[PDB]
Amino acid sequence: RKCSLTGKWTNDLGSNMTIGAVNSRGEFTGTYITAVTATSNEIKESPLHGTENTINKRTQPTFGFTVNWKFSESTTVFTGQCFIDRNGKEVLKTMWLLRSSVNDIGDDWKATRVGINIFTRLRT
Amino acid sequence: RKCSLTGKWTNDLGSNMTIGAVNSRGEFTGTYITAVTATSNEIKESPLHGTENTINKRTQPTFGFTVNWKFSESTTVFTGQCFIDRNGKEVLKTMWLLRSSVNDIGDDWKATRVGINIFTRLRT
Amino acid sequence: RKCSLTGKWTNDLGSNMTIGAVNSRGEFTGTYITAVTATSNEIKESPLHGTENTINKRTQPTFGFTVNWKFSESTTVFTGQCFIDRNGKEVLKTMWLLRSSVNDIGDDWKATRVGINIFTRLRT
Amino acid sequence: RKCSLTGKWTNDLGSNMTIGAVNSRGEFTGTYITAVTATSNEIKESPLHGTENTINKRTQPTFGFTVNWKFSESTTVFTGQCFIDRNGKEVLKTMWLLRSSVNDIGDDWKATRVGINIFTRLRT
């Protein structure tokens, strides 16, 4: 059996996400819920759109998703791999790119930040 | 007066992509065409899915998308901004993360590459 | 009350490093010890050279350094900040770029990997 | 004959650098001169410390260097490869990490930006 994207996840920074069902083509949607980035009020929710690589029907697939922020002009992309570890726990190890909006093409060079995130299943 | 993602673009390496109509939620799909990476043959086509940010309806929006490679177990994600350049040309400036599949979670650390890509309109 | 780089540290993967005294221009040298990457054997040691930023004499300075791999044609660069964590422990948080050698300039696009590393004091 | 680091270089953004002689060990120093980043007055100069990988005495070596900014609390690291192309011109293709200084360990996630730079010899 394989590492499944569908469901509820949580990270190290305290953000959560829900991913709906993965279609035949390898497609999925969900929502990204966060508490840190720049501002919000309290808790904010944004949609995510992604894909799971289905080649060789691997048990521990790679994937990618885009987060369309609703409270900002930015976009964030995540890519990683759905692993199985801890004693048999599912884990997502990801790396991301955060693109800020700049006003002029000449500041383009300073628009992209990078980092990681690790996700584990939310007690449920 | 409005950098649009819909269309045919080509890059700095020979790869091309075509993007469909963007819908009201800022969602789009498209196709990615290349021969790079490591696949000889002639040309391979893979699907892509992403979003364009609509907050504040900027004329030079940020966006993101994932390429679901059909001839590989990898995933590539792209993020950037659609700019109107000094000469009136539309230019996509992006950065990408290319995720390779590993067999052991232990090898995760070396699974991520990063680079840039510059796209220009081809549908002249 | 002052995160210092001088010392012995270990990371999240088993690698260790020792850094010498930092001089008045913020310059330092040291050694990097590991068995990862892809080199079996037991343990290999490579030299490192870098700087610590002294502008404003912050207590949690940023720094950078390069590892000159002695058993490979590659180069790795690290950058981060030396923090004093909530519990009083010193912590190095860094990101790295690992550059592999290519034969043709044409293959440049795929030569760069990126990741993270967390260091903790070992010289207890 | 090989691609040599020693000398004067210029980039795409309009910054310049001078690299002194490379010792036996593969070590070098130089200065980084820039006009864009955040502020300065007019033209600012900062020192750089790096290394050239000498394994297999390659003709087109990889290298890494750290830039110790003098007008800011940040640090930038560059890594890349010294190529030969254009009709036989020397070029440096680089990728970099820019670390900003943050006040608290909890904002660490947003401290690192990434990008590229291409350098060519300054008419001399």
Coordinates of all heavy atoms in Angstrom, one line a residue, chain B residues 42-108:
Chain B
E42 N 12.5 12.8 -29.7 CA 12.4 14.1 -30.4 C 11.7 15.1 -29.5 O 12.3 16.1 -29.2 CB 11.6 13.9 -31.7 CG 12.5 14.0 -32.9 CD 13.3 12.8 -33.3 OE1 14.4 12.5 -32.8 OE2 12.7 12.0 -34.1
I43 N 10.5 14.8 -29.2 CA 9.6 15.7 -28.4 C 8.5 14.9 -27.7 O 7.8 14.0 -28.2 CB 9.1 17.0 -29.2 CG1 8.5 16.6 -30.5 CG2 10.2 18.0 -29.3 CD1 8.8 17.6 -31.6
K44 N 8.3 15.4 -26.4 CA 7.4 14.8 -25.4 C 6.5 16.0 -24.8 O 7.0 17.1 -24.6 CB 7.9 13.9 -24.3 CG 8.7 12.7 -24.7 CD 8.0 11.9 -25.9 CE 8.0 10.3 -25.8 NZ 6.9 9.7 -26.4
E45 N 5.3 15.7 -24.6 CA 4.3 16.6 -24.2 C 3.7 16.2 -22.8 O 3.3 15.0 -22.6 CB 3.4 16.8 -25.5 CG 1.8 16.9 -25.4 CD 1.3 17.8 -26.4 OE1 1.9 18.2 -27.4 OE2 0.1 18.3 -26.1
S46 N 3.7 17.1 -21.9 CA 3.1 16.7 -20.6 C 2.1 17.8 -20.2 O 2.3 19.0 -20.6 CB 4.0 16.5 -19.4 OG 5.0 15.5 -19.7
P47 N 1.1 17.4 -19.4 CA 0.1 18.3 -19.0 C 0.5 19.3 -17.8 O 1.4 18.8 -17.0 CB -1.0 17.5 -18.3 CG -0.5 16.0 -18.2 CD 0.9 16.1 -18.9
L48 N -0.1 20.4 -17.7 CA 0.2 21.4 -16.7 C -1.1 22.0 -16.1 O -2.0 22.1 -16.9 CB 1.3 22.5 -17.0 CG 0.7 23.5 -17.9 CD1 -0.1 24.7 -17.2 CD2 1.7 24.1 -18.8
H49 N -1.0 22.3 -14.9 CA -2.2 22.8 -14.2 C -1.7 23.9 -13.2 O -0.7 23.7 -12.5 CB -3.0 21.8 -13.4 CG -3.3 20.5 -14.1 ND1 -4.7 20.0 -14.2 CD2 -2.6 19.6 -14.9 CE1 -4.7 18.9 -14.9 NE2 -3.4 18.6 -15.4
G50 N -2.4 25.1 -13.2 CA -2.0 26.1 -12.2 C -3.0 27.2 -11.9 O -4.2 27.1 -12.3
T51 N -2.6 28.3 -11.3 CA -3.4 29.4 -11.0 C -2.7 30.7 -11.3 O -1.5 30.8 -11.2 CB -4.0 29.4 -9.6 OG1 -3.0 29.4 -8.6 CG2 -5.0 28.3 -9.2
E52 N -3.5 31.7 -11.5 CA -3.0 33.1 -11.6 C -3.7 33.9 -10.5 O -4.8 33.7 -10.1 CB -3.5 33.5 -13.0 CG -3.3 35.0 -13.2 CD -4.0 35.5 -14.5 OE1 -4.0 34.9 -15.5 OE2 -4.4 36.7 -14.4
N53 N -2.9 34.7 -9.7 CA -3.4 35.5 -8.6 C -4.3 36.6 -9.0 O -3.9 37.4 -9.8 CB -2.3 36.0 -7.7 CG -2.8 36.6 -6.4 OD1 -3.3 37.7 -6.4 ND2 -2.4 36.0 -5.3
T54 N -5.5 36.8 -8.5 CA -6.3 37.9 -9.0 C -6.5 39.0 -7.9 O -7.2 39.9 -8.3 CB -7.6 37.3 -9.5 OG1 -8.2 36.6 -8.4 CG2 -7.2 36.5 -10.6
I55 N -6.0 38.9 -6.8 CA -6.1 39.8 -5.7 C -5.7 41.2 -6.3 O -4.6 41.4 -6.8 CB -5.3 39.4 -4.5 CG1 -5.7 38.0 -4.1 CG2 -5.5 40.3 -3.3 CD1 -7.2 37.9 -3.9
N56 N -6.6 42.1 -6.2 CA -6.4 43.5 -6.6 C -6.3 43.6 -8.1 O -5.9 44.7 -8.6 CB -5.1 44.1 -6.0 CG -5.3 44.4 -4.5 OD1 -4.4 44.4 -3.7 ND2 -6.6 44.7 -4.0
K57 N -6.6 42.6 -8.8 CA -6.6 42.6 -10.3 C -5.4 43.4 -10.9 O -5.5 44.3 -11.7 CB -7.9 43.2 -10.8 CG -8.9 42.1 -10.9 CD -10.3 42.4 -10.3 CE -10.5 41.8 -8.9 NZ -11.3 42.5 -8.0
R58 N -4.2 43.0 -10.5 CA -3.0 43.6 -11.0 C -2.8 43.3 -12.5 O -3.3 42.2 -13.0 CB -1.7 43.1 -10.2 CG -1.9 43.1 -8.7 CD -2.2 44.5 -8.1 NE -1.3 45.6 -8.7 CZ -0.1 45.9 -8.3 NH1 0.6 45.3 -7.3 NH2 0.6 46.8 -9.1
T59 N -2.1 44.2 -13.2 CA -1.9 44.0 -14.6 C -0.7 43.1 -14.8 O -0.6 42.6 -15.9 CB -1.7 45.4 -15.2 OG1 -0.7 46.1 -14.4 CG2 -3.0 46.1 -15.1
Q60 N 0.1 42.9 -13.8 CA 1.3 42.0 -14.0 C 1.2 41.0 -12.8 O 1.9 41.1 -11.8 CB 2.6 42.8 -14.0 CG 2.7 43.9 -15.0 CD 4.0 44.6 -15.0 OE1 4.8 44.5 -15.9 NE2 4.3 45.2 -13.8
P61 N 0.3 40.1 -12.9 CA 0.1 39.1 -11.9 C 1.2 38.1 -11.7 O 1.9 37.7 -12.6 CB -1.2 38.4 -12.4 CG -1.2 38.5 -14.0 CD -0.4 39.8 -14.2
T62 N 1.2 37.6 -10.4 CA 2.1 36.4 -10.1 C 1.2 35.2 -10.5 O 0.0 35.3 -10.5 CB 2.5 36.4 -8.6 OG1 1.3 36.0 -7.8 CG2 3.0 37.7 -8.1
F63 N 1.8 34.0 -10.6 CA 1.1 32.8 -10.9 C 2.0 31.6 -10.5 O 3.2 31.9 -10.2 CB 0.8 32.6 -12.4 CG 2.1 32.8 -13.2 CD1 2.9 31.6 -13.4 CD2 2.5 34.0 -13.6 CE1 4.1 31.7 -14.1 CE2 3.7 34.1 -14.4 CZ 4.5 33.0 -14.6
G64 N 1.5 30.5 -10.6 CA 2.2 29.2 -10.3 C 1.5 28.1 -11.1 O 0.4 28.1 -11.5
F65 N 2.3 27.0 -11.4 CA 1.8 25.8 -12.0 C 2.7 24.7 -11.8 O 3.9 24.8 -11.5 CB 1.5 26.1 -13.5 CG 2.7 26.4 -14.4 CD1 3.5 25.3 -14.9 CD2 3.0 27.7 -14.8 CE1 4.5 25.5 -15.8 CE2 4.1 27.9 -15.6 CZ 4.9 26.8 -16.1
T66 N 2.1 23.5 -11.8 CA 2.8 22.2 -11.8 C 2.8 21.5 -13.2 O 1.7 21.4 -13.8 CB 2.1 21.3 -10.8 OG1 1.9 21.9 -9.6 CG2 2.7 19.9 -10.7
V67 N 3.9 20.9 -13.6 CA 4.0 20.1 -14.8 C 4.0 18.6 -14.3 O 5.0 18.1 -13.6 CB 5.3 20.3 -15.6 CG1 5.3 19.5 -16.9 CG2 5.3 21.8 -15.9
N68 N 3.0 17.8 -14.7 CA 3.0 16.4 -14.3 C 3.7 15.5 -15.4 O 3.1 15.2 -16.4 CB 1.5 15.9 -14.4 CG 1.3 14.6 -13.7 OD1 0.2 14.1 -13.6 ND2 2.2 14.3 -12.8
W69 N 5.0 15.3 -15.3 CA 5.8 14.6 -16.3 C 5.3 13.2 -16.6 O 5.0 12.4 -15.7 CB 7.4 14.6 -16.0 CG 8.0 15.9 -15.7 CD1 8.5 16.4 -14.5 CD2 8.1 16.9 -16.7 NE1 9.0 17.7 -14.7 CE2 8.7 18.0 -16.1 CE3 7.9 17.0 -18.1 CZ2 9.0 19.2 -16.8 CZ3 8.2 18.2 -18.8 CH2 8.8 19.3 -18.2
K70 N 5.1 13.0 -17.9 CA 4.5 11.7 -18.4 C 5.5 10.7 -18.7 O 5.2 9.5 -19.0 CB 3.6 12.0 -19.6 CG 2.1 12.4 -19.3 CD 1.8 12.2 -17.8 CE 0.5 11.5 -17.5 NZ 0.6 10.9 -16.1
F71 N 6.8 11.1 -18.9 CA 7.8 10.1 -19.2 C 8.8 10.0 -18.1 O 9.9 9.4 -18.3 CB 8.4 10.6 -20.5 CG 9.1 12.0 -20.3 CD1 10.3 12.1 -19.7 CD2 8.4 13.2 -20.7 CE1 10.9 13.4 -19.5 CE2 9.0 14.4 -20.6 CZ 10.2 14.5 -20.0
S72 N 8.4 10.5 -16.9 CA 9.3 10.4 -15.8 C 8.5 10.3 -14.4 O 7.3 10.6 -14.5 CB 10.1 11.7 -15.7 OG 11.0 11.6 -14.6
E73 N 9.2 9.9 -13.4 CA 8.6 9.9 -12.1 C 8.7 11.2 -11.3 O 8.3 11.3 -10.2 CB 9.1 8.7 -11.1 CG 9.1 7.5 -12.1 CD 9.3 6.2 -11.4 OE1 9.9 6.3 -10.2 OE2 9.0 5.1 -11.9
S74 N 9.3 12.2 -12.0 CA 9.5 13.5 -11.3 C 8.3 14.5 -11.4 O 7.4 14.3 -12.2 CB 10.7 14.2 -11.9 OG 11.8 13.4 -11.9
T75 N 8.5 15.5 -10.7 CA 7.6 16.6 -10.7 C 8.4 17.9 -10.7 O 9.4 18.1 -10.0 CB 6.5 16.7 -9.5 OG1 5.8 15.4 -9.5 CG2 5.5 17.8 -9.6
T76 N 7.9 18.9 -11.6 CA 8.5 20.2 -11.6 C 7.5 21.3 -11.2 O 6.3 21.3 -11.7 CB 9.2 20.6 -13.0 OG1 10.2 19.7 -13.2 CG2 9.7 22.0 -12.9
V77 N 7.8 22.2 -10.3 CA 6.8 23.3 -10.1 C 7.4 24.6 -10.6 O 8.6 24.9 -10.4 CB 6.3 23.4 -8.7 CG1 5.4 22.3 -8.3 CG2 7.4 23.6 -7.7
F78 N 6.6 25.5 -11.2 CA 7.1 26.8 -11.6 C 6.3 28.0 -10.9 O 5.1 28.0 -10.7 CB 6.9 27.2 -13.0 CG 7.7 26.3 -14.0 CD1 7.4 25.0 -14.2 CD2 8.8 27.0 -14.6 CE1 8.2 24.3 -15.1 CE2 9.5 26.3 -15.6 CZ 9.3 24.9 -15.8
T79 N 7.0 29.1 -10.6 CA 6.3 30.3 -10.1 C 7.0 31.5 -10.7 O 8.2 31.6 -11.0 CB 6.2 30.3 -8.5 OG1 5.2 31.3 -8.3 CG2 7.5 30.6 -7.8
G80 N 6.2 32.6 -10.9 CA 6.8 33.8 -11.5 C 5.8 34.9 -11.5 O 4.7 34.9 -10.9
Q81 N 6.1 35.8 -12.4 CA 5.2 37.0 -12.7 C 5.2 37.3 -14.2 O 6.2 37.0 -14.9 CB 5.7 38.2 -11.8 CG 4.8 39.4 -11.8 CD 5.1 40.4 -10.7 OE1 6.0 40.2 -9.9 NE2 4.4 41.6 -10.8
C82 N 4.1 37.7 -14.7 CA 3.8 38.0 -16.0 C 4.0 39.6 -16.1 O 3.2 40.3 -15.5 CB 2.3 37.7 -16.4 SG 1.7 37.6 -18.2
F83 N 5.0 40.1 -16.7 CA 5.4 41.5 -16.8 C 5.1 42.1 -18.2 O 5.2 41.4 -19.3 CB 6.9 41.6 -16.7 CG 7.4 41.5 -15.3 CD1 8.2 40.3 -14.9 CD2 7.1 42.4 -14.3 CE1 8.7 40.2 -13.6 CE2 7.6 42.2 -13.0 CZ 8.4 41.2 -12.6
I84 N 5.0 43.4 -18.2 CA 4.9 44.1 -19.5 C 6.3 44.8 -19.5 O 6.6 45.7 -18.6 CB 3.9 45.2 -19.7 CG1 2.4 44.7 -19.5 CG2 4.1 45.8 -21.1 CD1 2.2 43.5 -20.5
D85 N 7.2 44.4 -20.3 CA 8.6 44.9 -20.4 C 8.7 46.3 -21.1 O 7.8 46.8 -21.7 CB 9.3 43.8 -21.2 CG 10.8 43.8 -20.9 OD1 11.4 44.7 -20.2 OD2 11.4 42.9 -21.5
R86 N 9.8 47.1 -20.8 CA 10.0 48.5 -21.3 C 9.6 48.7 -22.8 O 9.1 49.7 -23.2 CB 11.4 49.0 -21.0 CG 11.6 49.5 -19.6 CD 12.1 50.9 -19.5 NE 13.3 51.1 -20.2 CZ 13.4 52.1 -21.2 NH1 12.4 52.9 -21.5 NH2 14.6 52.2 -21.8
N87 N 9.8 47.7 -23.6 CA 9.4 47.8 -25.1 C 8.0 47.3 -25.4 O 7.8 47.1 -26.6 CB 10.4 46.9 -25.9 CG 10.4 45.4 -25.5 OD1 11.3 44.7 -26.1 ND2 9.6 44.9 -24.5
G88 N 7.2 47.1 -24.4 CA 5.9 46.6 -24.7 C 5.7 45.1 -24.9 O 4.7 44.6 -25.1
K89 N 6.8 44.3 -24.8 CA 6.7 42.9 -25.0 C 6.2 42.2 -23.6 O 6.5 42.7 -22.5 CB 8.0 42.3 -25.5 CG 8.0 42.3 -27.0 CD 8.9 41.4 -27.8 CE 8.3 40.3 -28.6 NZ 9.2 39.6 -29.5
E90 N 5.4 41.1 -23.7 CA 5.0 40.3 -22.6 C 6.2 39.4 -22.2 O 6.7 38.7 -23.2 CB 3.8 39.4 -22.7 CG 2.5 40.1 -22.6 CD 1.4 39.6 -23.5 OE1 1.7 39.3 -24.7 OE2 0.3 39.5 -23.0
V91 N 6.5 39.2 -21.0 CA 7.6 38.4 -20.5 C 7.3 37.6 -19.3 O 6.9 38.2 -18.2 CB 8.8 39.2 -20.1 CG1 10.0 38.3 -19.9 CG2 9.2 40.2 -21.2
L92 N 7.4 36.2 -19.4 CA 7.2 35.5 -18.1 C 8.5 35.2 -17.4 O 9.4 34.6 -17.9 CB 6.6 34.2 -18.4 CG 5.0 34.1 -18.5 CD1 4.4 35.4 -18.9 CD2 4.6 32.9 -19.3
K93 N 8.7 35.7 -16.2 CA 9.9 35.4 -15.4 C 9.6 34.4 -14.4 O 8.7 34.7 -13.6 CB 10.6 36.6 -14.8 CG 10.6 37.8 -15.7 CD 11.9 38.6 -15.6 CE 13.1 37.9 -16.1 NZ 14.3 38.4 -15.3
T94 N 10.3 33.3 -14.4 CA 10.0 32.2 -13.4 C 11.2 31.6 -12.9 O 12.3 31.7 -13.4 CB 9.2 31.1 -14.1 OG1 10.1 30.5 -15.1 CG2 8.0 31.7 -14.9
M95 N 11.0 30.9 -11.7 CA 11.9 30.0 -11.1 C 11.2 28.7 -10.9 O 9.9 28.6 -10.8 CB 12.4 30.6 -9.8 CG 13.3 31.8 -10.0 SD 14.5 32.2 -8.7 CE 15.6 30.8 -8.9
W96 N 12.0 27.6 -10.8 CA 11.4 26.3 -10.7 C 12.1 25.4 -9.7 O 13.2 25.7 -9.3 CB 11.2 25.5 -12.0 CG 12.5 25.5 -12.9 CD1 12.9 26.4 -13.9 CD2 13.6 24.7 -12.7 NE1 14.1 26.1 -14.4 CE2 14.6 25.1 -13.6 CE3 13.9 23.7 -11.8 CZ2 15.9 24.4 -13.7 CZ3 15.1 23.1 -11.9 CH2 16.1 23.4 -12.8
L97 N 11.3 24.5 -9.2 CA 11.9 23.4 -8.3 C 11.6 22.1 -9.0 O 10.4 21.9 -9.4 CB 11.4 23.3 -6.8 CG 11.6 24.5 -5.9 CD1 10.8 24.4 -4.6 CD2 13.1 24.6 -5.6
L98 N 12.6 21.3 -9.2 CA 12.4 20.0 -9.9 C 12.6 18.9 -8.9 O 13.7 18.8 -8.3 CB 13.4 19.9 -11.1 CG 13.8 18.5 -11.4 CD1 12.7 17.7 -12.1 CD2 14.9 18.6 -12.5
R99 N 11.6 18.1 -8.6 CA 11.7 17.1 -7.6 C 11.9 15.8 -8.2 O 11.2 15.3 -9.0 CB 10.4 17.1 -6.8 CG 10.2 15.8 -5.9 CD 11.2 15.9 -4.7 NE 11.4 14.7 -3.9 CZ 11.7 14.7 -2.5 NH1 11.8 15.8 -1.8 NH2 11.9 13.6 -1.9
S100 N 13.0 15.1 -7.8 CA 13.2 13.7 -8.3 C 12.7 12.7 -7.3 O 12.6 13.0 -6.1 CB 14.7 13.5 -8.4 OG 15.3 14.0 -9.6
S101 N 12.3 11.5 -7.8 CA 11.8 10.5 -6.8 C 13.0 9.7 -6.1 O 13.9 9.4 -6.7 CB 10.9 9.4 -7.5 OG 11.6 8.5 -8.3
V102 N 13.0 9.6 -4.8 CA 14.0 8.8 -4.1 C 13.3 7.5 -3.5 O 12.1 7.5 -3.3 CB 14.8 9.5 -3.1 CG1 15.7 10.5 -3.8 CG2 14.0 10.1 -1.9
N103 N 14.1 6.4 -3.3 CA 13.5 5.2 -2.7 C 13.5 5.2 -1.2 O 12.7 4.6 -0.5 CB 14.2 3.9 -3.3 CG 13.4 3.4 -4.4 OD1 12.3 2.9 -4.3 ND2 14.0 3.4 -5.6
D104 N 14.5 5.9 -0.6 CA 14.5 5.9 0.8 C 14.4 7.4 1.3 O 15.0 8.3 0.7 CB 15.7 5.3 1.5 CG 15.7 5.2 3.0 OD1 14.7 5.0 3.6 OD2 16.8 5.6 3.5
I105 N 13.6 7.5 2.3 CA 13.4 8.8 2.9 C 14.8 9.3 3.3 O 15.0 10.5 3.5 CB 12.6 8.7 4.1 CG1 12.6 10.1 4.8 CG2 13.4 7.8 5.0 CD1 11.3 10.4 5.5
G106 N 15.7 8.4 3.4 CA 17.0 8.9 3.8 C 17.7 9.7 2.8 O 18.6 10.5 3.1
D107 N 17.3 9.5 1.5 CA 18.0 10.2 0.4 C 17.3 11.5 -0.1 O 17.8 12.2 -1.1 CB 18.3 9.2 -0.7 CG 19.3 8.1 -0.4 OD1 19.5 7.7 0.8 OD2 19.9 7.7 -1.4
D108 N 16.3 11.9 0.7 CA 15.5 13.1 0.5 C 16.3 14.4 0.3 O 16.0 15.2 -0.6 CB 14.6 13.3 1.7 CG 13.6 14.4 1.5 OD1 12.7 14.4 0.6 OD2 13.9 15.4 2.2

